[PDB]
Amino acid sequence: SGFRKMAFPSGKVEGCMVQVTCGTTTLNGLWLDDVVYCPRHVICTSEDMLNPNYEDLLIRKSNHNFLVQAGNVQLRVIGHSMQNCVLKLKVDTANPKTPKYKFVRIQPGQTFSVLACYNGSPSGVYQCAMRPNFTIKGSFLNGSCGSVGFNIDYDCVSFCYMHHMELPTGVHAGTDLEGNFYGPFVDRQTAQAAGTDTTITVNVLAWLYAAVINGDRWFLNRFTTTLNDFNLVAMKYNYEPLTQDHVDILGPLSAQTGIAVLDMCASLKELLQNGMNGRTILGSALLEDEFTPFDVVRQCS
Amino acid sequence: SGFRKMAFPSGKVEGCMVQVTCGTTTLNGLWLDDVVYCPRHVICTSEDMLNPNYEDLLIRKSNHNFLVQAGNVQLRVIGHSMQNCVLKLKVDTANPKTPKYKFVRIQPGQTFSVLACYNGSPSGVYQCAMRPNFTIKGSFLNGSCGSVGFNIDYDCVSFCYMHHMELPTGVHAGTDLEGNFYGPFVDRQTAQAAGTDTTITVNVLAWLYAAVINGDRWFLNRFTTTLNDFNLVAMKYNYEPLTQDHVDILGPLSAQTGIAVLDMCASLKELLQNGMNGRTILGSALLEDEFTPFDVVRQCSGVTF
């Protein structure tokens, strides 16, 4: 029993964190096999931040310009290439701590663990979700660039995020491990703004099922709703539309608790209308949207 | 920017998690040097659990009755002893992954990271506070016993908790690494209830400072209060008393944000007597009490491990 925001054990990722220095900039790199991955903006100066030409800047760099440090050992860079917004630094030593890994691109609503690092050293691990506006609400200070988001698949690490920047509102933007940004963001100091954030509806429903599995039932009601009537209501509270895929994904939780998805949807509609009335659900006074249906099944069952 | 419930990196502790099997029971052990620590209830059956004489049960056991598995390698037990509610299994191999460590007993209000394990394999890491009633509001399923709570201080792991049981209300109880239970709990199948919980006041103040550092200032007010007037209000709302030590520990955050501790107490006092009024602090509609002042400084300063 109990329900917590739980991150994956970070050990397999800690053994991959290195420090990458280029000129005056120092950020984090991910050392897998003989390659170190890091945000390409590490090669940027002050004048080359509003409108950098990364192909031009990287052509001017040599392998000896990159200083890679794995613990107290300096790694030798023997090659450099760019894949979208990520810089790949080929090194002369394969990481003996390289786990079984994959690079995966996630969709909004998906959750992942973040290993926040500074100077190639892990300082903390926390849980995030890719927001519907493609930002992540992280906890990052200057120097955190290159910190990675991941999930663990039994023995395998799926790297899904690399931190690149902080938007003016305090939210964070980054890329997958192939350097493709999540969202309409660019790695330039140009005026950028995240789209209006919305609640991940399927995750709220998954969390209401987790609450029922944990014995919280006060919010349940005798009502059901159509998927379309639910979406008309949800949208007015800035909740993401619930698709038929989301209803299907909620199926196992629906079968386990005996509460149909559209029946839980009516419970959620009532909660949006009434609020909590001084009550809590799983120790929370707000509807939590950073637990996917997969997280709930994994943690509860 | 941003504020998250953040656990310490769990790597140093993952290299210590092993699986301990005794008869039909399988739980987790902590392998440090040539010793494996685990809850002593691993030697219990159903009859034993109801009223156990652990000295008598352990005397009947031999080293070969304990099956310790570190990954895919079986470790051979060469000795067994009991220290309070923890069983110590001497093994023939020292853990090459043993970090710099200490066994520390924490106080209520102190926070620590929990590496939840099943079958000697880590499945998740979460941060939590030792409640004033000595329980932890954790997340544990059957098989999680022996999962450990820890803190990291520079390159030193301070082990502060080992999971033993789940109370009828869904909260958890366990011991320090010397087998001494936190709270009035016993490792026996009997009626046990946690005392009424209270809010960790110093932690709420630390979290209000974290909110100010993050730009959330609506709750700040022109007022200040005496420590005695604040404590009288705190007692009334099931909040722990704030000591002069707590005020001193909040000093650096007070200096950083320009808001004196007793000034933040007047804001907390109003928040209790009036509520949030539909507003949130750090995305929360409740006052959060599982961030100590050191956690807040560590996160809003970037300390690494």
Ligand SMILES: O=C(Cc1ccc(F)c(Cl)c1)Nc1cncc2ccccc12
């Ligand atoms: O924002 C930057 C650096 C940066 C600046 C401009 C730019 F266009 C790009 Cl691609 C990157 N990284 C930081 C990351 N996280 C939190 C941060 C808090 C404070 C300061 C910096 C943070």
Ligand SMILES: O=C(Cc1ccc(F)c(Cl)c1)Nc1cncc2ccccc12
């Ligand atoms: O604590 C026990 C076993 C046990 C029972 C009685 C007793 F006195 C002692 Cl010392 C140990 N179990 C469980 C612990 N934590 C989470 C659990 C979730 C689900 C199921 C079982 C869990």
Ligand SMILES: [Cl-]
């Ligand atoms: Cl998880």
